[PDB]
C-alpha cells in the first residue's frame, strides 16, 4: 500500500498526456493564482 504527497501545486495546464507530465501540473485551471508560498488561490476580483 503506497502513498505520496504532491508538495506544491505550481502549476497550470499541462496538455501533455498524464503519464508523461510532472506533478504540480493540473489538467485544467481557471481563475487560479499559483503563488510562491501559498499554492492555488482565487484571482483577486475586478473592482468596478
Partner 1 sequence: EDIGRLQLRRAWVNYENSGTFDIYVENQSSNWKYTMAGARLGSNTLRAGR
Contact residues for partner 1, defined by CB under 8 A: 3-5
- What's the min distance (Å) between Cβ of 45 and partner 1? 33
Residue of 34, 30, 35, 32 lying closest to 43 (CA atoms): 32
- Residue number with CB closer to partner 1 (4 or 31): 4
- Residue number with CB closer to partner 1 (32 or 39): 39
- Residue number with CB closer to partner 1 (5 or 15): 5
Amino acid at each position: 500500500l503506497i502513498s505520496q504527497s504532491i508538495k506544491n501545486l505550481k502549476g497550470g495546464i499541462s496538455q501533455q498526456p498524464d503519464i508523461l507530465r510532472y506533478p504540480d501540473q493540473g489538467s485544467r485551471q481557471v481563475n487560479g493564482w499559483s503563488s510562491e508560498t501559498e499554492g492555488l488561490q482565487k484571482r483577486p476580483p475586478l473592482v468596478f
